[PDB]
């Protein structure tokens with residue numbers, strides 16, 4: 001049993017030049033494929049773009065699910081964020097259906113560690 005939810009979108013350093021949205025990734029599981037049984041970590045969209053690219057580089061012909069993308073339609077910021085949230089949740093759901101993508105150490109550090117993306121990358125490049 002694996003329950004993965006992308007939840008509670010929030011604006012970080014709000015009212016500032018470098019404000020951005022990140023998303024809470026809730027993972028609960030009874031599988032020791034994970035080092036922790038409950039995790040919460042916050043990830044921003046550009047971190048997901050990195051993860052998709054790092055998964056492709058390690059997975060050979062195993063197909064990596066698509067990220068939602070950018071819309072060509074104005075709406076509310078609220079409806080855009082909600083469609084994106086749904087796309088990030090579908091992406092993680094489909095990742096976690098592959099034995100091969102599940103085995104990837106970069107996926108485990110993304111979902112269950114507080115390591116930044118350059119620190120995760122430095123761990124793999126540094127052995």
Ligand SMILES: CCCC(=O)OC[C@H](COP(=O)(O)O[C@@H]1[C@H](O)[C@H](OP(=O)(O)O)[C@@H](O)[C@H](OP(=O)(O)O)[C@H]1O)OC(=O)CCC
Pocket residue numbers: 020021044045046047049050069070071117
């Ligand atoms: C870890 C260092 C990353 C670095 O600073 O680069 C980021 C840079 C972003 O430039 P760009 O290629 O335009 O990519 C943008 C960022 O990924 C941004 O992520 P975030 O800031 O929310 O996390 C999205 O919100 C934005 O979506 P939208 O346009 O509003 O629909 C997207 O276009 O380009 C990319 O990483 C390629 C993404 C396709």
